[PDB]
Structure formats: structure tokens, C-alpha cells
């Protein structure tokens, strides 16, 4: 059931794709590979086709390519991008060189939405509800997104949202424990990002737009207060602890004064997300049950993920072993239904 491929050079890269994909037109992109928008004649939708650049160049890359393919094959949720298709022109493992990924194609991200209209409080409720619902799913597979920000959130005309572009340039949405490498970090770095996104949707202002790491830490500590002893004990680096203790102590601000005029249930949820100690931050599942989302919350329609086996991260393999495992994964891909 190998399709018919056709090859065509555009922007000095050869694209060799099944004929179901028509009207390929470049849109970038960067270090991981080039992407074209295309029309998928099987499904009737527009899609993004990504050609991986040099997927098997070193051990680090071959493993990275395998990691991304494993992750994308696994993610099956309304609010998380999934893999529509993956293919190679290769007919055998011998001859295997290129990998192409197909996904849905984002019209607008969240910045475009904010740019073309004023969001109501109800829009912010639905948008954030959908992020947390996606996140509940991701986190239940022991996956951490690590790079949530407005431009990694696709949003359509119906205000339906999907989370894109997992890690793995804007630092403003990043939890401080990872920004300054304080510790072995957990899933709630993503909740910190949601708090930053939601605060900015409510006020129109970026919450922590620091010009460098220190400046941003100072903006953050000003709002949430300097760390107490309990958090200080959990910072692994002595230099990090030492730098932190050199700061003048600062109390937590009253969030009602910071977010004047916002729905008080919104502000309350922000205080649950923007907590410096990541062990005290609200989880995605808990956030979905918050009175802020009473119009959208449905505990029977908030699924978790199948178990996701990441024991491959520990394997020590040759380039050709990563590449052959990647090939297996291309061969076993089953597309979404109808």
C-alpha cells in the first residue's frame, strides 16, 4: 500500500511526497526542518508537511528524531496536535534517509486572535479551560511540554484550541526553577506558563517581560514574594541559594490590586498557578475543577492518555539503531479514522 510519490524541487530542497498532497507552498521554517502548507486531497483539509533536516546526522539527532516521532504518534486529544501522517520515499531501511511529518496546519495562534479582537471573559474561560484539558492529558502520560506560550497555541474561528510544538526565542512564560536551573523540575512548570498566558489575556500586558534572566526573576519575585526557607531547601545549587539569600526580602503582592477589574474567580485561579514553590502549584486536573470553569468543566469529558513508555531515553544505541527504530515507527503508523 505504498502510494505514488512525485518529486519536485522548491526553494532548493527536493520534496518527494505522495500524490495525495497537492499544491505544496513553503512557509519556513528553521533548525529541525522546512515546512510546506499543502492540500490533503484524501481528507479535504489543509495540512503542514514538515521535511526533517538531517534526522540521522549524529547520535544526538537520530535519537531526537525518534523521540519526536514517538511523542507525536502517541498524542491523541482534541486540544493537542496529532500526527495525521508520516512517510518516507524509501522503499527499504537501506535507502531510508528522509522523514516527513504531516499535521493539521494552524490558521492563527493565540497572538493573532488577540490582535484581531478584544476577548471577553467568556473567551478567556474557554481558551484557558482548553489548555488545561490538553495539559491534563499530556501530564497523565508523564510528558512535560516545557515551552507553552501564545505562539505554540493554535486557535480557530470557533475559539477551539490545540497545543503545538513540544520541547525538544521568548523566556517570558518560563517557570523560574527552569529559567535559572534551580532543580530537577516537574510538570507544574507548564501550569506556571498557563498563569502567564492567562494574566496577559486578562490585562493585555505581558506579565513578566524581563530583558534577561535576572531582570525577569526580579519581576517575578516582586509579584510572588522572595522564597521562604521551605523552598530554599529545595534549590540544589548552593550558588543559586546564595544569590537568592542576597536579595532583599519581599512579600507577596495582593493579586486583587494587580488585576483590578478582572473576574475575582480568575484572579483566584491565577494565585493558584503563580506560586513560586512548584510543589504548591495547582495541577492541571485540579485547575479544571476550579469555579472559574463551571460553565465548561465536565469531569466525564476530560480524558487521560494511554501509558507512554519513555524507557528508550536510557538506551545507548548506534546511529543506525536509532534510525532503524525510527523506520519501524514510520512503518507501524496507523492514520486517524475516516
Amino acid at each position: 500500500e505504498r502510494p505514488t510519490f512525485y518529486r519536485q524541487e522548491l526553494n532548493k530542497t527536493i520534496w518527494e511526497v505522495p500524490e495525495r498532497y497537492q499544491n505544496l507552498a513553503p512557509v519556513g521554517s528553521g533548525a529541525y526542518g522546512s515546512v510546506c502548507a499543502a492540500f490533503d486531497t484524501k481528507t479535504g483539509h489543509r495540512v503542514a508537511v514538515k521535511k526533517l533536516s538531517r534526522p540521522f546526522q549524529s547520535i544526538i539527532h537520530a535519537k531526537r528524531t525518534y523521540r519526536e516521532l514517538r511523542l507525536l504518534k502517541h498524542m491523541k486529544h482534541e486540544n493537542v496536535i496529532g500526527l495525521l501522517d508520516v512517510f518516507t520515499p524509501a522503499r527499504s531501511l537501506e535507502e531510508f534517509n528522509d522523514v516527513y511529518l504531516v499535521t493539521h496546519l494552524m490558521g492563527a495562534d493565540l497572538n493573532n486572535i488577540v490582535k484581531c479582537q478584544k476577548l471577553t471573559d467568556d473567551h478567556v474561560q474557554f481558551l484557558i479551560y482548553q489548555i488545561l484539558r490538553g495539559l491534563k492529558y499530556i501530564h497523565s502520560a508523564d510528558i512535560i511540554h516545557r515551552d507553552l506560550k501564545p505562539s505554540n497555541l493554535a486557535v480557530n474561528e470557533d475559539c477551539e484550541l490545540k497545543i503545538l510544538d513540544f520541547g525538544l526565542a521568548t523566556r517570558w512564560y518560563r517557570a523560574p526553577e527552569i529559567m535559572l536551573n534551580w532543580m530537577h523540575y516537574n510538570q507544574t512548570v507548564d501550569i506556571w506558563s498557563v498563569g502567564c498566558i492567562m494574566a496577559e489575556l486578562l490585562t493585555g500586558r505581558t506579565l513578566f517581560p524581563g530583558t534577561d534572566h535576572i531582570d525577569q526573576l526580579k519581576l517575578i519575585l516582586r509579584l510572588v514574594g522572595t522564597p521562604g526557607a521551605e523552598l530554599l531547601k529545595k534549590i540544589s545549587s548552593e550558588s543559586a541559594r546564595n544569590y537568592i539569600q542576597s536579595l532583599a526580602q519581599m512579600p507577596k503582592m495582593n493579586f486583587a490590586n494587580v488585576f483590578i477589574g478582572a473576574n475575582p474567580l480568575a484572579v483566584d485561579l491565577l494565585e493558584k498557578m503563580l506560586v513560586l514553590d512548584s510543589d504548591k502549584r495547582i495541577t492541571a486536573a485540579q485547575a479544571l475543577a476550579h469555579a472559574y470553569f463551571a460553565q465548561y468543566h465536565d469531569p466525564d469529558d476530560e480524558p487521560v492518555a494511554d501509558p507512554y513508555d519513555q524507557s528508550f531515553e536510557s538506551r545507548d544505541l548506534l546511529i543506525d539503531e536509532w534510525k532503524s527504530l525510527t523506520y519501524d515507527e514510520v512503518i507501524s503508523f496507523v492514520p486517524p479514522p475516516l
Binding site: 490558521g107 492563527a108 486572535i113 490582535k115 484581531c116 473567551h123 481558551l127 486557535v155 480557530n156 470557533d158
Partner: peptide, 11 residues
């Protein structure tokens, strides 16, 4: 939450 514009003239 209803009927959004996706695209608009500015920047």
C-alpha cells in the same frame, strides 16, 4: 465562546 476573526490588517 463563539465567532472569532483569524486574520486581520495590521502590524
Amino acid at each position: 465562546a463563539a465567532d472569532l476573526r483569524i486574520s486581520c490588517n495590521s502590524k
